[PDB]
Amino acid sequence: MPNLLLNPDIHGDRIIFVCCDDLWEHDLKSGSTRKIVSNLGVINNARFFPDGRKIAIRVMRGSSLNTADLYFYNGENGEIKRITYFSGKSTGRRMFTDVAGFDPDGNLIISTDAMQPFSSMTCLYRVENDGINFVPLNLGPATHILFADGRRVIGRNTFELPHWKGYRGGTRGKIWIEVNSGAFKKIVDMSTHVSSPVIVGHRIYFITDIDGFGQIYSTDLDGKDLRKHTSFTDYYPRHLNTDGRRILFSKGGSIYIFNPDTEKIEKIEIGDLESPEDRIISIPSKFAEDFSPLDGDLIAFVSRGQAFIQDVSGTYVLKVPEPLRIRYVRRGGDTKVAFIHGTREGDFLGIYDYRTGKAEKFEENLGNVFAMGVDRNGKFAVVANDRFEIMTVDLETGKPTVIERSREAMITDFTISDNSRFIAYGFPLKHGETDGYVMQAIHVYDMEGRKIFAATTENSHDYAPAFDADSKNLYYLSYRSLDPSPDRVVLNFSFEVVSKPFVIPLIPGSPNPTKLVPRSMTSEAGEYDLNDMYKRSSPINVDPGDYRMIIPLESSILIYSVPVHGEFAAYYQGAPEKGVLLKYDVKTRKVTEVKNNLTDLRLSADRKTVMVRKDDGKIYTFPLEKPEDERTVETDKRPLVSSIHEEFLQMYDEAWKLARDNYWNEAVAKEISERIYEKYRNLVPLCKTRYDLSNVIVEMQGEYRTSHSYEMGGTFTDKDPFRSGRIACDFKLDGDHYVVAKAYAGDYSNEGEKSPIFEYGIDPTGYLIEDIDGETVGAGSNIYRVLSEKAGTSARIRLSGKGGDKRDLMIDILDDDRFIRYRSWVEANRRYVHERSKGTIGYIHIPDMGMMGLNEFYRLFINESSYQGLIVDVRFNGGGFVSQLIIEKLMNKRIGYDNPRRGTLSPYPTNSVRGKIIAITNEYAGSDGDIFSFSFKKLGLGKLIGTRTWGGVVGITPKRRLIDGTVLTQPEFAFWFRDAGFGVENYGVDPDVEIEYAPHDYLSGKDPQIDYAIDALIEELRN
Amino acid sequence: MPNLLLNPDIHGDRIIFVCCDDLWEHDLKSGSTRKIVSNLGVINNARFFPDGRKIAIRVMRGSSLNTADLYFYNGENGEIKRITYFSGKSTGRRMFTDVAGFDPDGNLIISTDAMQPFSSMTCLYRVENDGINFVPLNLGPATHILFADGRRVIGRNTFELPHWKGYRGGTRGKIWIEVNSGAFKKIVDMSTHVSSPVIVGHRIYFITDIDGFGQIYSTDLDGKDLRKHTSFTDYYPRHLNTDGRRILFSKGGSIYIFNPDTEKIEKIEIGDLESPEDRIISIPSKFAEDFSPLDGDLIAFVSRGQAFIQDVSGTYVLKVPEPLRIRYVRRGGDTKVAFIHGTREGDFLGIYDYRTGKAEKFEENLGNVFAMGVDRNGKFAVVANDRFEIMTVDLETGKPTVIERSREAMITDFTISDNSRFIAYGFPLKHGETDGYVMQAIHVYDMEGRKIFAATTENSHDYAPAFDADSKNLYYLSYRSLDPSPDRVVLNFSFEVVSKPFVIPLIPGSPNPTKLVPRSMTSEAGEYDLNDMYKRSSPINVDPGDYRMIIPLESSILIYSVPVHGEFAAYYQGAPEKGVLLKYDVKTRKVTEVKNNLTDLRLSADRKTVMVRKDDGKIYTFPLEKPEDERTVETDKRPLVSSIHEEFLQMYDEAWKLARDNYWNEAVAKEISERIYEKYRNLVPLCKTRYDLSNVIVEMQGEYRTSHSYEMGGTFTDKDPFRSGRIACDFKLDGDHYVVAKAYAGDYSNEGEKSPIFEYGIDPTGYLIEDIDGETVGAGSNIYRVLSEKAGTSARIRLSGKGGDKRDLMIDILDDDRFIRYRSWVEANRRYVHERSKGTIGYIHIPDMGMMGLNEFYRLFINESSYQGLIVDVRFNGGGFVSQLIIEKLMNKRIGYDNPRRGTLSPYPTNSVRGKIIAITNEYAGSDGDIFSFSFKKLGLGKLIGTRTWGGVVGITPKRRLIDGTVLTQPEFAFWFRDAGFGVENYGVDPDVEIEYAPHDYLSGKDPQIDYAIDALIEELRN
């Protein structure tokens, strides 16, 4: 059982590399190997210093390796020391904050965005005093910095891209070079991506897959004389590193060597190194899901692919006796529960009796199940697959019977009548193969006569169907109560609270039960008749809002309400939505609160037990009759047990299946999948850590050669994320004191947009930081570290300005100051554009096409839209989906005015740009950012200035995760531009005018992109 | 900066050893070193298998390394695997559950007490199927098992004893040997302790300090031909281990080699290996203490030697700017706090103003301070030292002035009048230099006239003095309200609730304020007169109970009550005592509850703020006027920061000082201390882990050559303790199924004394365990592991007995079953003694001389005391202090009877033993156990049978701990037996008849000690 070796570095006979997240050293001479450093978290890069004595190491921390920082290793005394306290943000695809290289003097040059507004601004910094001070090289963003003959060699976006093989977009790795002690020239700019550059002698060796596969090449210090050296076919080579003599690298999990002279490729022998305990223990709550209430006051829940029947206490627990991957568990009888078991083949229905033991599992495939339920009389079950089908499976025989198939989306919202006769469900529809919206009409299926009826019309969104106990009327919710709500910032209106409940008696002639129509004055007791029942529909007198569930009770109705709120947290942090359980008494027609702070709710089949999760993450349970009596559902009593190798295989196959099942093009999928499966499956057994699995999985995802194949979430370590103390400032070591080199601030009156020092009425810029919380900082005291240890609290900071000016304030040491830096940048550029255009041009910047973008666009769109000209800077735009909405705005043309008796003119439309517009874009703007760029030109809103953009317009919508919480993504929505097709994908967008931003432009402190834009508009504004 | 190397093992050129809790391997040949295993917790022993390929490792877990288990290491593939799930209990002095040796076949033999009733029964077991099955060798308790010429060599109690150099007690390490394929003979039994035995050729090499220091010796396989090989003088050698050729060992932190042939000693070169981050982060709550409320609703508290001023929230925190070791912090003004700083020299008073910054620290030494307080007007402070002095320190000048010095105990209970004029305190006294009890009388000191007065008489215990706001009357509590409470088991009575409050008006003529004597009917307003004030004393009408504090308020009085409760938990688990704050309204004379679940309480100087800790460990704070409004005091917001090397030095010096300051003999102390200081201080800088420090400290404690020098508590790891699933049963692998070899049970009707399976009315013995919680256990499934994973929960266990008998019950998987095994043993021996003496002899066993002992003694004393003869088995007795109480019982002689008209005779006394008594004792009974043994003979209660006992009769009473919570102990109370002196110490007690318990006696399954006892009594019972 060998390991998965990777990311090596060489120096003489010694060779360091990574295995099991730890760092190892190998001596070709003796042939021995040893672990030189461990227990620091997950390590992915280790670099030999010039002398070959010390080693710079990049280690990641946080459950999902969302944070990272650099460490030093002295192989002389075995000393270990943290160098940076930046807590750089990183993801699988962009593992920023690493070693850039070493300067001639033998000093370490790092690449980080810790002090930058945009993650992609991984600017270069020279490390001094072991992390005490940091001197910027002002060469702009870079991933590698080599030196040759006194010439700086810069590698841009030159990190590996395993997730996207054959990438040819604008963010492809490129190489520049110095020519005139300050002048730079781009020398390697192939059609494909260039990664991991090295210089042996006077040639730069790098990797690219221009020929269709990853190989090693080289060229003189002028990007000329290209040569193809290796000819691999098994796995792409990665992580090139050298010592000046030979080149080192990794492939398919082994460490190889390439001698530039001999041009010979040889594999290093290392054999087995480490085989940790395969049987691991996990905490059920960390991976729990699908919590459901059963009879006898029991509970059912799924975790890490396993299922359990336990009591609220968590003291008596039973595991369902079934192999890996239980997707769903559902009450199917007094002591019987029905489950959904998934395998590489698909999803299958199962049944288990936690009393006897009988667990006969079916074999009839159901495809990819996403919803499952069982009638109250354990006769059959209802299932929804990704084929958009809703079906009934005979819980006795196992024969699934398709009832109806939607052609727009899955039928996951359904309910069964208590008498097991009707099945009401939401049926997504469209009235055209290209409609912009998808309607949803409730459908009712009758088990007798086997026929479908329309409970609702197909003009809006009707959902949450639910029958009453006696099964006499069908209740449901709908967004039909249209009534606009005003926007407090932008002239606009939205449908905020347009949800309302309705009812439909299954017996014609019977009135709305909530209308309290005296029995003596009605003549019900007719007979079921579901024909044209959508005509008998009636609403229930309850104020419009945002309802997600309706539960009909004897003399009351429970409703789940979701108060209006922003979507920022939900969009970026996946933060759960907050609701509250409301009660409506039919008699009194009064509403009340039953339970708040709910983020999820489930209800028993008997309607007597309620199970819910609150905003605190915990799960509770209480009787509907006495909601005051809730208990906490504990599950962390019994350890969760599993096998790494069994889970890793399971996880690989699922990742491999989703990638295949969700790829936008089914054809390409059948081929790529079938051609990459085995190849990458053989590496799984070499994996010992979640990080090992990641390497295998990502490389296999790259085999689809498309954008948006990401891997997020998942548990990679038990190490806590790195902390970084921030006060929105820039420090500089000058003598024996740290000086406030810069004090970031954007809109003083906005929230969280300035150095917390400003609250004390003083701009820290220029002042000298004496000490923090008593401890003196400076020449012999790392301020970065001290601040790190105070992150998230308030500390006393003694400062000193001009003269005898001395301050001693309680400052809030923030955990992050990115946004403050972003806003600072935007406001700077905004001030710049005004002054240079003599107050005739506006400025607006769009960070992404998500909630934040929407925020930033409108934040300035309301003050900048009425200038002679407008600059819509969309550089570094991270994509999203709201581009269409922003374009729609800019699309407006001013065609009139309103003349008031008093006041100023009112432009019509209001959201109309006054004059000429111009867009700025770089290679760091992609996805929706790609779409926005192409559109801006295509619609002729103005000229596009900058550099070709990213080029990944195949959207995604993940709907399933791995048993460890990992959320993988698959390019499922290919964007097709009219008169261009899918051309944008794997290419990007070409600006009308290309304005490069060379390393020398950064050294001169000039932005050639924004300058051109401004100067260009002034020219157009001469008319 | 080198490391502290230790506990090595050798094999050829390779040499494994421990450094920084991790295991390392060194190759003499190449001279290189590497860490072969880490992150398992703290490792102290590593043993090479025969083939030299695999390695057995013993690792400890739990904050205080209170738990341990064994792991395997395959140097071929680098596989790691946990072998045992016993969760063996261990302490610094007795690190049980380790590798005993290897049998001829190359199998691992382990020594553990996991399945034994007494910790000292570290019986031998052969490991099979990598921990699947365990086969007992039935050779009795052993620490080492070697083999030579087909002869078993057993080493009893042969582990190292660094804490007690020159130990010559009965538990001293000894060596036995087989002579007749079943017959054993003791061969090495020197006067001193023999540790770490090895066999090179045909000689056993071990270590002993018979010459006054640790050295290596050897003798033929007959304990003959003694030879002294080494002649060290720097540090004792430890952990001998060999491969058959050369011997390996450690000394003063280095690894050495000894060649039996050459007889040459050589040091192995290893140099620096690991130097972790010196700056560590700790959690304040984990080491907090001395929490105190200040003004402005602020809080003060001490942790890990540091002090802080923070708000209840813990958001605004200030550290007191003072070097290590702040013992106490006390409010001394609006923004000023007084503190007690400790150094190697002693304790000193200090003052800090968290507003300005002025922190002038005094230099006048105060000795060892244990109580400190400041008047309400920040003029002076009151201090109590271990010299038994109470003094006033001028908070301005610094001049301490001794007021009074007790000669019995410290004066820690004192209070200052609000007007700063009187100082009331408890003054411990005796009316004889040999009295059995120490009385305590409240004393009052007047700052004006400077004279002491007697507030109370010296006939009992008067405490908790407290003045009223106006400083007109002095309140206090006393245990004078004598009134006996009946014992529900043993004919006895105790003073349970005899506490009551009293008051003393400082102005003669003034009545008891609580008596509500109409002002119009009294003529107070006299003048202070403290003369014969103890005559004016008066009680306050409040029911007797167990009060710890009394707080006089305007029209009410607060009293801290402690409901009667057992002391088991408090005695063994140090569990805090539970109290409740009560309120007494002077007017209504009615009592009420203010706050419960309190385990500690503090009160502001203004009597308006209350700070308390509840049984949940958290700290709260609430206004006395509105006790319903309490907030939680948080402190874990700001990380606690420190330096390992600065703390380690601090901790060493303190451990070194306490050891010196508390040794029973001052003379011996001055010499030993001064002679061992530097020698062990030079090792501190080599320490990197708490375990490294422990090694140094323990060795230095051993330099006192006395018993009771222990080291408990302290934080050694962040690893959670090992878990062990137990159901009071013994399993045996038979084929492919585990069989219940034994089902332990003691008194079926008592609590926690039988296998939880019994509750289902079935004796598991004989049955076959099929599966647990679904998972099948047996040949290919470690039941020990499975049970471990269900510890502390209830699991479904399928069993199978004779015929088609099959059970399926929900069993409680316990975390431990020691007590159930102990009770089983006692009951077995009890049943045995009855049957063999034909029902004429009783049996009683005393496990220790603590609360449990008291429990077990009376548990059987009431049914066994009236037989013709009695056996008081006190083997394995762990000591304590209640021996005197048990003797007093047995001391009773039956001299009469009560003849009833109906019923049976009543013996007088009731607690009188009917006839002849006989005691059984082994080397595993010590301390009070030692005292009991000597006494039993000395008083002639009967004969003593067994083997010489432990020999450590120098008691301890720790009263101070290290900044990391570590609790060190120092032999402070030397026991002097009349007509024998201190002879018992370092020797033990000699039984009238010596009955050894050889290994062959265990193999025959016979107890020669209990047999002799029974047979001997029958002989005496012939009269």
Tab-separated table of C-alpha atoms in Angstrom, chain B residues 6-152:
chain	number	residue	atom	x	y	z
B	6	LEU	CA	14.718	9.069	27.204
B	7	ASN	CA	13.410	5.499	27.498
B	8	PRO	CA	15.292	3.925	24.584
B	9	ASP	CA	15.262	0.425	23.145
B	10	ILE	CA	17.909	-1.131	20.926
B	11	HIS	CA	18.024	-3.567	18.040
B	12	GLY	CA	21.143	-4.006	15.990
B	13	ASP	CA	22.257	-0.629	14.736
B	14	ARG	CA	18.805	0.891	15.098
B	15	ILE	CA	17.784	2.590	18.345
B	16	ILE	CA	14.281	3.877	19.135
B	17	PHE	CA	13.696	6.398	21.917
B	18	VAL	CA	11.252	9.081	23.111
B	19	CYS	CA	11.661	12.833	22.444
B	20	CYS	CA	8.881	15.417	22.765
B	21	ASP	CA	6.271	12.757	23.569
B	22	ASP	CA	6.920	11.326	20.095
B	23	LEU	CA	8.868	8.216	19.070
B	24	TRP	CA	12.151	8.501	17.235
B	25	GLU	CA	14.544	6.089	15.545
B	26	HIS	CA	18.316	6.453	15.361
B	27	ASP	CA	20.833	4.566	13.207
B	28	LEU	CA	24.290	4.377	14.778
B	29	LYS	CA	25.637	3.403	11.401
B	30	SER	CA	24.572	6.480	9.409
B	31	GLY	CA	24.201	8.641	12.509
B	32	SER	CA	20.826	9.974	11.316
B	33	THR	CA	17.601	10.288	13.295
B	34	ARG	CA	13.917	10.501	12.373
B	35	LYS	CA	10.483	10.659	13.960
B	36	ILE	CA	8.727	7.367	13.123
B	37	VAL	CA	5.407	8.098	14.872
B	38	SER	CA	3.637	11.151	16.293
B	39	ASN	CA	0.362	12.862	17.151
B	40	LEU	CA	-0.872	9.870	19.169
B	41	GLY	CA	-0.506	11.638	22.476
B	42	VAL	CA	2.198	11.152	25.079
B	43	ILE	CA	4.462	8.134	24.585
B	44	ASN	CA	6.806	6.883	27.303
B	45	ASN	CA	7.671	3.303	26.248
B	46	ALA	CA	8.475	1.703	22.901
B	47	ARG	CA	9.514	-1.917	22.515
B	48	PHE	CA	11.102	-3.719	19.573
B	49	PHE	CA	9.452	-6.955	18.535
B	50	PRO	CA	11.712	-10.027	18.112
B	51	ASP	CA	12.132	-9.625	14.332
B	52	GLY	CA	12.939	-5.973	15.001
B	53	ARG	CA	10.343	-5.064	12.349
B	54	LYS	CA	7.276	-4.028	14.400
B	55	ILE	CA	7.220	-1.969	17.593
B	56	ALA	CA	4.819	-2.045	20.548
B	57	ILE	CA	4.098	1.460	21.885
B	58	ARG	CA	2.381	2.591	25.093
B	59	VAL	CA	0.674	5.954	24.731
B	60	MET	CA	-1.132	8.099	27.295
B	61	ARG	CA	-4.132	10.435	26.752
B	62	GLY	CA	-6.329	12.680	28.901
B	63	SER	CA	-5.474	16.137	30.211
B	64	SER	CA	-3.440	14.544	33.027
B	65	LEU	CA	-2.444	11.392	31.197
B	66	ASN	CA	-4.944	9.569	33.401
B	67	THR	CA	-5.588	7.005	30.659
B	68	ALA	CA	-3.458	4.768	28.449
B	69	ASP	CA	-3.498	2.044	25.772
B	70	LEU	CA	-1.176	0.113	23.462
B	71	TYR	CA	-0.409	0.598	19.727
B	72	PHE	CA	1.494	-1.347	17.045
B	73	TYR	CA	3.901	0.110	14.519
B	74	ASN	CA	4.930	-1.673	11.337
B	75	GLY	CA	8.166	-0.113	10.105
B	76	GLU	CA	7.647	-1.982	6.835
B	77	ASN	CA	4.577	-0.133	5.571
B	78	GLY	CA	4.381	2.560	8.239
B	79	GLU	CA	1.099	1.172	9.525
B	80	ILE	CA	-0.163	2.292	12.940
B	81	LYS	CA	-2.842	0.407	14.883
B	82	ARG	CA	-4.401	0.590	18.353
B	83	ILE	CA	-4.095	-2.821	20.030
B	84	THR	CA	-5.890	-2.479	23.373
B	85	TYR	CA	-9.101	-0.676	24.315
B	86	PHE	CA	-8.743	-1.181	28.059
B	87	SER	CA	-8.291	2.504	28.901
B	88	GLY	CA	-5.962	1.430	31.705
B	89	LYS	CA	-5.794	3.794	34.639
B	90	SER	CA	-2.361	5.274	35.281
B	91	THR	CA	-0.624	7.938	37.371
B	92	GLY	CA	2.907	9.302	37.318
B	93	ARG	CA	4.039	6.804	39.954
B	94	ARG	CA	2.184	3.800	38.543
B	95	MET	CA	2.032	3.927	34.759
B	96	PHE	CA	0.316	0.563	34.371
B	97	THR	CA	-0.740	-1.262	31.183
B	98	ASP	CA	2.545	-1.633	29.296
B	99	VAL	CA	4.662	-4.212	27.419
B	100	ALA	CA	5.834	-7.003	29.715
B	101	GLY	CA	8.096	-8.686	27.186
B	102	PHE	CA	7.983	-11.241	24.385
B	103	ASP	CA	7.521	-15.005	24.561
B	104	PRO	CA	9.802	-17.475	22.730
B	105	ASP	CA	7.371	-17.617	19.796
B	106	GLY	CA	7.867	-13.900	19.318
B	107	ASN	CA	4.528	-12.853	20.775
B	108	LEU	CA	3.922	-9.730	22.844
B	109	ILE	CA	3.178	-10.159	26.532
B	110	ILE	CA	1.460	-7.223	28.202
B	111	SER	CA	0.938	-6.233	31.801
B	112	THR	CA	-2.419	-4.689	32.721
B	113	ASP	CA	-4.997	-4.334	35.479
B	114	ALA	CA	-7.835	-3.369	33.124
B	115	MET	CA	-9.764	-6.509	34.105
B	116	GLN	CA	-8.604	-6.682	37.693
B	117	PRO	CA	-10.214	-5.271	40.862
B	118	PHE	CA	-7.020	-3.701	42.183
B	119	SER	CA	-4.760	-1.457	40.154
B	120	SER	CA	-1.683	-3.271	41.515
B	121	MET	CA	-2.938	-6.541	39.966
B	122	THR	CA	-1.030	-5.778	36.767
B	123	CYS	CA	-1.391	-9.384	35.674
B	124	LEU	CA	0.305	-10.799	32.563
B	125	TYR	CA	-1.515	-11.351	29.244
B	126	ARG	CA	-0.467	-12.693	25.823
B	127	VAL	CA	-1.637	-10.581	22.879
B	128	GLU	CA	-3.348	-12.463	20.057
B	129	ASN	CA	-4.685	-11.436	16.633
B	130	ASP	CA	-3.443	-7.908	17.187
B	131	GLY	CA	-5.703	-7.260	20.195
B	132	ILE	CA	-8.590	-9.544	19.208
B	133	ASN	CA	-8.079	-12.098	22.016
B	134	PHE	CA	-6.120	-12.018	25.312
B	135	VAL	CA	-4.751	-15.186	26.938
B	136	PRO	CA	-3.799	-14.897	30.670
B	137	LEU	CA	-0.492	-16.365	31.862
B	138	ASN	CA	-1.813	-16.691	35.432
B	139	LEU	CA	1.585	-15.837	36.850
B	140	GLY	CA	0.231	-13.142	39.147
B	141	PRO	CA	1.110	-9.402	39.011
B	142	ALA	CA	4.226	-8.533	37.028
B	143	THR	CA	6.030	-5.692	35.388
B	144	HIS	CA	8.547	-7.666	33.291
B	145	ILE	CA	8.588	-11.175	31.860
B	146	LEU	CA	11.848	-12.442	30.289
B	147	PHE	CA	12.801	-15.883	28.993
B	148	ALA	CA	16.044	-17.799	29.293
B	149	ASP	CA	16.731	-21.415	28.478
B	150	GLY	CA	13.019	-22.181	28.500
B	151	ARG	CA	12.702	-20.555	31.902
B	152	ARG	CA	10.254	-17.809	32.755
